[PDB]
Each structure stands twice: as C-alpha cells, then as structure tokens.
Design an enzyme around this catalytic site. Structure first.
Site, PDB file in Angstrom:
ATOM      1  N   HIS A 109      60.410  41.229  11.142  1.00  0.00           N
ATOM      2  CA  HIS A 109      59.989  42.475  11.544  1.00  0.00           C
ATOM      3  C   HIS A 109      58.820  42.739  10.825  1.00  0.00           C
ATOM      4  CE1 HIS A 109      63.841  42.537  13.539  1.00  0.00           C
ATOM      5  NE2 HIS A 109      63.745  43.511  14.355  1.00  0.00           N
ATOM      6  N   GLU A 171      60.776  39.134  21.109  1.00  0.00           N
ATOM      7  CA  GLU A 171      60.913  40.389  22.146  1.00  0.00           C
ATOM      8  C   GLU A 171      59.386  40.861  22.356  1.00  0.00           C
ATOM      9  OE1 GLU A 171      63.792  43.523  20.958  1.00  0.00           O
ATOM     10  OE2 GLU A 171      65.222  41.678  20.384  1.00  0.00           O
ATOM     11  N   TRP A 176      57.856  47.426  22.100  1.00  0.00           N
ATOM     12  CA  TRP A 176      58.181  48.262  20.879  1.00  0.00           C
ATOM     13  C   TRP A 176      57.736  47.882  19.298  1.00  0.00           C
ATOM     14  CZ3 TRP A 176      61.095  46.899  25.139  1.00  0.00           C
ATOM     15  CH2 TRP A 176      61.713  45.558  24.990  1.00  0.00           C
ATOM     16  N   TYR A 244      70.719  43.479  25.051  1.00  0.00           N
ATOM     17  CA  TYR A 244      71.710  44.451  24.553  1.00  0.00           C
ATOM     18  C   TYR A 244      72.234  45.169  26.012  1.00  0.00           C
ATOM     19  CZ  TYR A 244      70.575  43.438  19.825  1.00  0.00           C
ATOM     20  OH  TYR A 244      70.357  42.805  18.603  1.00  0.00           O
ATOM     21  N   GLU A 278      69.878  37.161  20.519  1.00  0.00           N
ATOM     22  CA  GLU A 278      70.149  38.445  20.170  1.00  0.00           C
ATOM     23  C   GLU A 278      71.209  38.886  21.290  1.00  0.00           C
ATOM     24  OE1 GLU A 278      67.913  41.869  18.377  1.00  0.00           O
ATOM     25  OE2 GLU A 278      66.763  40.200  17.371  1.00  0.00           O
ATOM     26  N   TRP A 318      73.742  42.241  15.929  1.00  0.00           N
ATOM     27  CA  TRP A 318      72.894  42.821  14.918  1.00  0.00           C
ATOM     28  C   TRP A 318      73.746  43.365  13.559  1.00  0.00           C
ATOM     29  CZ3 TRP A 318      68.669  40.413  14.622  1.00  0.00           C
ATOM     30  CH2 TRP A 318      67.888  41.168  13.643  1.00  0.00           C
TER      31      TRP A 318
HETATM   32  C1  LIG Z   1      67.729  44.262  16.313  1.00  0.00           C
HETATM   33 AS1  LIG Z   1      66.068  43.887  17.238  1.00  0.00          AS
HETATM   34  C2  LIG Z   1      64.717  45.341  16.451  1.00  0.00           C
HETATM   35  O1  LIG Z   1      65.589  42.708  16.654  1.00  0.00           O
HETATM   36  O2  LIG Z   1      66.061  44.161  18.946  1.00  0.00           O
END
Ligand SMILES: C[As](C)(=O)[O-]
Length: 451
Positions: A109, A171, A176, A244, A278, A318
């Site tokens: 991130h 992602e 985002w 998710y 994920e 997560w």
């Molecule tokens: C938990 As995430 C910010 O990698 O979707």
C-alpha cells in the site's frame, strides 16, 4: 520444468511456485495479514503469536505482510525507526513465519509520493508521476530499493533466501488507490507493473520473489474485463482476485464462483497459479463490520462444490487491527464458531499441513523474449514537450532497436542505456518499436494521445 517470471530464481522459490500449483483443487491454504504482528488475543506481539493460532490451534498457512511496515506505518515497523531498521524487523518476522512453517506474501500500500499522503490519497496524478520518465520516478525507484533490501534480508539462519509472493499495485481495477483505473490507462498501469518486475529482478537481482497480480473482484467471470490490465505472461506468476462481501447471498456466491473459476481457467491455460488473494467480510468481522450468518463455511462450500473454482492455491483474509476492524473472529464475535468450522474443514490448509513446499526440484523454463515500450506507455497522453522513448527488451540478446511514430511522422534509433532500457530523446498517435534480436525481430505498438 515450470514457467516462472524469474527464470533464475532460487530453487526454493521455483519449488514454492510448483507446490502452489499442485495444491490447486486438492486443498486451499488459508492466509492472514499481519497474523503475528496484530492481534486481539495475543497481547503485545513479537512475530510468534497469532489470533488464528489461538482460535484454531494452528497458524495460517500463509502469512501476509505489507511494505507499510518498511514505511513504519504498520508494526513491527515503527514511525521513529529508519526504513532500514524497519526492514530488519520485517525480515525478522518473515524468518519467524518461515520457522513456524508458513508461506510469506507481501502486498504494498505505497505512500502517495507526490502529496505525502497515504495510499488512499488519490490526488497528485502519482501513478503517471511515478512511471519511467515521470517527475517522481526516482521516488519509486528508492522505494523499490528498500523492497530489494527486504528481499535480501529474508534469509533462513543457514543463509537460504526465503521465498516471497510479492503482490504490488493490487485492485487497480477500482479507483480507491492512487494506482487505480481513474489515474492511468491500462497501458500506463502495465508499464508500472512491468517496470516493478524488471527493476527488482533485472536491475536489483532479486531471486526469491514470485509475482502476483490481482486487479480486484466482481468481474462476473468476464475474461475480457479481468485481463484488460493484465501485465503479461512474462510478468505474472500468480493470478489473483480480491473480494469482500457482507451479504452472504446466493447472488454474491454465484458471482464469486464465476470469478474464481475464470481465474482458474486462465491460470491452467497459461500454466500459472491462481489464488483468492483477498477475501473477507466487508468492513470486517468486528464492531464496525458485519456478521453474515455462516459466511465462512458458506463461502467455502460454494468454492469446493465447484470443480473449477476450487482450483485456487490460497485465500488470505485481512488483518486483526483492533476491536472495530478485524477479519478473523475472536471470542465475542458472532462469526467465531463458523470461522472455526471453516478452519476445521479438511479442504482448508494451515501451517502444520504445509510441508515440503520448498524441497521440490523443478527447473525454470527459459525466460520468454519480450519487448514493450515503457514510455510513452500505451494509452498515455503526450504533451508537445521533450520526452525520452524507452524500450525494454528482455529474455534475448538485442543488437538494435528502432521506433516509428506513425499517424510515419518520425523515426528514432535507440541506444542501450547500459542497465535496463534502449532509449532516445523524442520531441513530439502510433509508436512502434522494432528490436533485432537473437530470438529474431520483435516488435510492439503503443497508441498514445496528444495533448
Ligand atoms: C485490505 As485492502 C486495502 O488490500 O483491500
């Protein structure tokens, strides 16, 4: 012999990739982010205790981490520390995970280099600023150097490099993150991912990395949308999916299975590994999350009920940050019972059930010849200003590279820069590069827009 992004990766690394592919359809490894660094039942952490271990009896098969550790934004990383000491703490936890018997994976991130903001700060046009030739490109290179350091520091006591599944720029199908779809064309994203692989592998010599690519989720089994951002066979080892949900509905489950079998199919066709990179309840399983009834077992059931969707090596949920936000249920959470049943199920594999992942003897298929134009990237907007055209040619000996800007308004003769690209200054629609190599004459074409 197997098709692996880093044809010259350590034997353990080649073995892991082999293991992961062979596990598909047989069992799926359960993974958890910051499993030994963040916990609600562990008390202060030191990389040896986990909520997963505490509520299921075994550590997860997969230990997920993040470069936010290096930045000192997530433990064991500390704000006060230098990135070098954070890196040292990071490697220590990987070593410990490896000792416990799990597989390590690292996401990233990345901080917003332009604004100084977080990965969620999407202003700054940071993706383009970070691409080769971009104003903040040097910032990305330095960040990648620290990751190369981490890769080198991740060694067993006997000096053996510990294999790591590196999953950068995830992602990107959504917006985002600053490296998302609204901040760069599919081509610009591809060059970012490609540069990341080549820089770490071809310039830094990292050899214990398996590369994962997961654009996101909810593709409804649509191959075309899923692969629009695909970096290419020469750059990806693991095909991922991040999803998710907080409904647990049949619609969700149907969509999930569609997506999971899609990646399994693409993976088998390409001879690569696919995985549920994920997954989890949206917003988590805690205070600020939700408790969909039997969510974990319902999701597991749907997966193993389908012969194709079950062909995925692992599924990581997560981190367990705090009471309000955590993904693995702990005493007090309504979903604890269901999660434990999910853990008890024979199809889900934990640390103790993962053995000999790094002991196989597999040969790496020869690196495939590839050529791509790092700048201007396909889909990019080119201003009238002076720029540099850089072409990457790997997996083969190159004698010459040429570029033609058609619409043929120009012809440039490139020269190797002596580490990575063949370049040439260019002062400005179609940019085609042709490289005369041992593997023959290879070419590629990027379509750019003028400002
Ligand atoms: C938990 As995430 C910010 O990698 O979707």
């Amino acid at each position: 012999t197997i098709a692996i992004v880093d044809a010259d990766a350590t034997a353990e690394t080649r073995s892991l990739l082999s293991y992961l592919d062979g596990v598909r359809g047989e069992g799926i490894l359960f993974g958890h982010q910051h499993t030994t660094s963040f916990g609600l039942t562990t008390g202060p952490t030191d990389g040896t205790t986990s909520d997963v271990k505490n509520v299921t009896g075994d550590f997860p098969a997969v230990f997920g981490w993040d470069t936010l550790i290096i930045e000192g934004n997530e433990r064991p990383g500390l704000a006060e520390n230098t990135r070098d000491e954070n890196i040292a703490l990071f490697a220590d936890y990987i070593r410990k995970a490896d000792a416990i018997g799990g597989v390590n994976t690292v996401s990233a991130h990345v901080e917003n280099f332009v604004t100084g903001g977080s990965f969620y700060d999407t202003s700054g046009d940071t993706l383009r600023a970070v691409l080769p030739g971009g104003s903040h490109h040097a910032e990305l290179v330095a960040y990648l150097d620290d990751i190369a350091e981490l890769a080198d520091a991740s060694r067993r006591d006997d000096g053996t490099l510990i294999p790591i599944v590196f999953r950068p720029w995830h992602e990107n199908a959504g917006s985002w993150f600053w490296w998302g779809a609204a901040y760069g064309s599919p081509g610009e994203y591809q060059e970012l991912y490609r540069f990341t692989v080549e820089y770490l592998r071809d310039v830094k010599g990292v050899s214990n990395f398996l590369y994962a690519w997961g654009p996101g989720g909810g593709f409804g089994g649509n191959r075309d949308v899923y692969l629009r951002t695909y970096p290419g066979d020469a750059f990806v080892d693991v095909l991922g999916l991040d999803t998710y949900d907080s409904t647990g509905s049949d619609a969700f489950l149907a969509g999930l299975v569609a997506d999971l079998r899609m990646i399994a199919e693409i993976a088998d066709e390409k001879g690569k590994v696919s995985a549920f990179t994920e997954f989890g309840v949206s917003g988590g399983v805690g205070t600020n999350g939700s408790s969909p009834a039997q969510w974990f077992t319902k999701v597991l059931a749907a997966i193993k009920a389908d012969p194709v969707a079950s062909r995925n090596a692992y599924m990581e949920t997560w981190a367990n940050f705090d009471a309000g936000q955590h993904f693995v249920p702990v005493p007090g959470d309504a979903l604890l019972e269901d999660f434990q049943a999910y853990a008890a199920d024979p199809f889900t594999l934990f640390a103790s059930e993962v053995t000999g992942a790094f002991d196989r003897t597999v040969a790496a298929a020869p690196a495939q010849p590839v050529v791509h134009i790092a700048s201007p990237a396909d889909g990019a907007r080119v201003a009238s200003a002076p720029t540099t055209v850089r072409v990457r040619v790997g997996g083969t000996d190159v004698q010459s590279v040429t570029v033609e800007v058609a619409q043929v308004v120009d012809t440039l003769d490139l020269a190797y820069d002596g580490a990575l690209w063949w370049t040439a200054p260019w002062s400005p629609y179609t940019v085609t590069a042709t490289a005369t190599t041992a593997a023959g004459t290879l070419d590629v074409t990027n379509e750019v827009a003028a400002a």
